Amino acid sequence: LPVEYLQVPSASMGRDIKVQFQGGGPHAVYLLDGLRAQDDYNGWDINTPAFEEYYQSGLSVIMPVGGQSSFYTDWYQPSQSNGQNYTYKWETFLTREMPAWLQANKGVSPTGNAAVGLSMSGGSALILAAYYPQQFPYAASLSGFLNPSEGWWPTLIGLAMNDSGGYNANSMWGPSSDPAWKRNDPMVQIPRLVANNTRIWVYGGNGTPNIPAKFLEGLTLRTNQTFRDTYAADGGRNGVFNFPPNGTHSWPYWNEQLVAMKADIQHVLNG
């Protein structure tokens, strides 16, 4: 398999970002990582056969490497405690710096692509489509945080980020009253997704991959149901909602969904 590892300079983050890449078409699937993203390889390549599954699909595959607990967003400041000596600017990287580099050097189109995320980056994918519809007419969220600004979620996200590399949610989007929380909330941005006619693919699993597991499961179930209902209520007509009883929040089932959506992405992006 013709998989490459690239070093893509980020002016905004003052460092080179590693990117795993497989070509095969002008349009690409951006495969975003989970909460515990490592600096050597993207979680999709560590845990799944994603590259082989999309080989000769007519689509390129882009796996950015790094950004533990980053939510693939532009942060207010360096994270307080874990000694981060720069500010995460991953929205700037994914929407400006990386597509410019791939276009200039490889001919990958900056427009007409898919953003696919899981866990932490499920919401990221929807937000990227909400604000950059020309770049991402297609977005998939697999076990994402669909309402991060509401209820228990700012606290739970803060706890998760701290457990994953000691990152500080306050440095990212401020206190939960800060406008950045609603700005980056897929539920709140459903009207953008509808206006843009974004093709969205939303998966939620069940079960358990402190606070009792059943309580957390109840929160996840309710928020997922609210997102689906609100999308329909707001005029949404271009979504796929997959909530199978036996689905889990795990790489094997996230891969099952990535395979299931391949025909969907091919038809939407390549006709």
From Swiss-Prot:
The active site is at 119 (nucleophile), 217, 249. Substrate binds at residues 35-36, 119, 147, 219-222, 226, 249-251. Inhibited by 6-azido-6-deoxy-alpha,alpha-trehalose (ADT). It is found in: Secreted. It comes from the Bacteria. One of its GO terms (cellular component) is extracellular region. Residues 51-61 are annotated as: Fibronectin-binding. It catalyses: an acyl-CoA + a 1,2-diacyl-sn-glycerol = a triacyl-sn-glycerol + CoA; 2 alpha,alpha'-trehalose 6-mycolate = alpha,alpha'-trehalose 6,6'-bismycolate + alpha,alpha-trehalose. Disruption phenotype: Cells lacking this gene transfer 40% fewer mycolates to the cell wall with no change in the types of mycolates esterified to arabinogalactan or in the composition of non-covalently linked mycolates. As a consequence, the diffusion of hydrophobic chenodeoxycholate and of hydrophilic glycerol through the cell envelope occurs much more rapidly in mutant cells than in wild-type. Its EC number is 2.3.1.122, 2.3.1.20. The antigen 85 proteins (FbpA, FbpB, FbpC) are responsible for the high affinity of mycobacteria to fibronectin, a large adhesive glycoprotein, which facilitates the attachment of M.tuberculosis to murine alveolar macrophages (AMs). They also help to maintain the integrity of the cell wall by catalyzing the transfer of mycolic acids to cell wall arabinogalactan and through the synthesis of alpha,alpha-trehalose dimycolate (TDM, cord factor). Belongs to the mycobacterial A85 antigen family. Homodimer. This is Diacylglycerol acyltransferase/mycolyltransferase Ag85C. It comes from Mycobacterium tuberculosis (strain ATCC 25618 / H37Rv). The gene is fbpC. The chain holds residues 52 to 328 of 340 of the full protein.
